């Protein structure tokens, strides 16, 4: 036969899900949708392992049968739906609102935003297409098509999107002084600004970022997400504000009882 695989084994699941190596040979195996498997979590993980509202898988099912969970203002009943980075989650029965973010480690957390902040999100552009009749469509990291994009929006910058109507509110550029969150290896939740851009011709582009403690790190261009202009961020942040300390200082701080 040799077709598409349908099962996922536990020790082969992405490590940032933090699954018990005992109790089971399998993992939920997220469905196909707006996010990649390795850059997302299935809804069962969020709703049982993190929030602890459910005890088993079937309890997640009984929760989702009654239409009380919404992602991006739409109800979802799929137990393996992918959730992903900047999405908002609303639970009517508890009247709660969350936004997923990376912490200073490489793992996802629900951030518990307020009701007013629950009406938008930030999307970063991946490419811009020109189609019949000369209209321009932007494709976001969210796997989303936005027609009639403003002519000044380019490939790597981010945009702010209303959720009741799929319209654009404003857009944020990708420059030397913009504020950034990094989303891949060796620095997955750090927030810094930007120092320089390299532009190697045939290969990857490297950019450098400076912390608010004057610490500097670098990464690839493809795992850089703009979250604000020079001064302030446009969303609330988790408690560390993306400041990563080394292990000696972290151990010293933790030793306060």
């Amino acid at each position: 036969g040799k077709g598409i695989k349908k099962h996922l084994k536990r020790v082969n699941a992405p490590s940032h899900w933090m699954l018990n190596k005992m109790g089971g040979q399998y993992a939920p195996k997220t469905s196909s949708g707006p996010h990649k498997l390795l850059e997302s979590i299935p809804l069962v993980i969020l709703l049982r392992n993190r929030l602890k509202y459910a005890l088993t898988f079937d309890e997640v099912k009984m929760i989702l049968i009654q239409k009380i969970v919404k992602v991006d203002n739409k109800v979802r009943t799929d137990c393996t739906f992918p959730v992903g980075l900047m999405d908002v989650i609303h639970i009517t029965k508890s009247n709660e609102y969350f936004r997923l973010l990376y912490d200073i480690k490489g793992r996802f957390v629900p951030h518990r935003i307020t009701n007013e902040e629950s009406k938008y999100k930030l999307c970063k552009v991946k490419k811009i297409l020109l189609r019949k009749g000369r209209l321009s469509i932007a494709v976001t990291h969210d796997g989303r098509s936005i027609p009639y994009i403003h002519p000044d929006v380019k490939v790597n910058d981010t945009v702010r999107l209303d959720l009741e109507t799929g319209k654009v509110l404003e857009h944020l550029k990708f420059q030397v002084g913009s504020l950034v969150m990094v989303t891949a290896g060796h620095s997955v939740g750090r927030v810094g600004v930007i120092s320089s851009i390299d532009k190697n011709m045939g290969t990857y582009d490297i950019i450098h970022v400076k912390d608010s403690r004057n610490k500097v790190f670098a990464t690839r261009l493809s795992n850089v997400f703009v979250i604000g202009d020079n001064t302030k961020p446009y969303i609330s942040l988790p408690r560390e504000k993306g400041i990563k300390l080394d292990i000696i200082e972290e151990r010293r701080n933790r030793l306060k009882a």
Partner: protein, 121 residues
């Protein structure tokens, strides 16, 4: 008779219709206050008029003796118990009593039924 209950990591779950919590029971120099007594104390502790909305499971007695750990579960009413509790728990509580035990010999019936044709099988 003489025991103390300490309820830990208490949490309310409006998505389901229950409260869920951990438990620890201190009974020095005696052994294993019964599950029936714990329900009655919890009903008083939580003003639970009735008693048939409480579910307890996973009790261990902690080598050495004198203390026990477990889990507990308190429901909004009886209808919420039957809606979303499994059948095996619902039998231990006595709410239902069904033991249809036809066995795994339905595989025999399944196999010798597909070889017969539309009308008779």
């Amino acid at each position: 008779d003489q025991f103390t209950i300490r309820v830990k990591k208490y949490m309310s779950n409006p998505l389901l219709r229950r409260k869920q919590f951990a438990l620890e029971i201190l009974h020095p120099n005696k052994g294993s206050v019964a599950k029936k007594e714990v329900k009655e104390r919890l009903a008083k502790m939580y003003k639970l008029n009735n008693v048939n909305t409480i579910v307890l499971f996973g009790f261990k007695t902690l080598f050495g003796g004198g203390r026990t750990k477990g889990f507990g579960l308190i429901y909004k009413n009886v209808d919420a118990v039957k809606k979303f509790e499994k059948k095996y728990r619902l039998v231990r509580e006595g709410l239902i009593d069904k033991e249809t035990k036809a066995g795994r010999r339905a595989s025999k019936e399944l196999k010798n039924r597909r070889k017969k044709v539309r009308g008779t099988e």
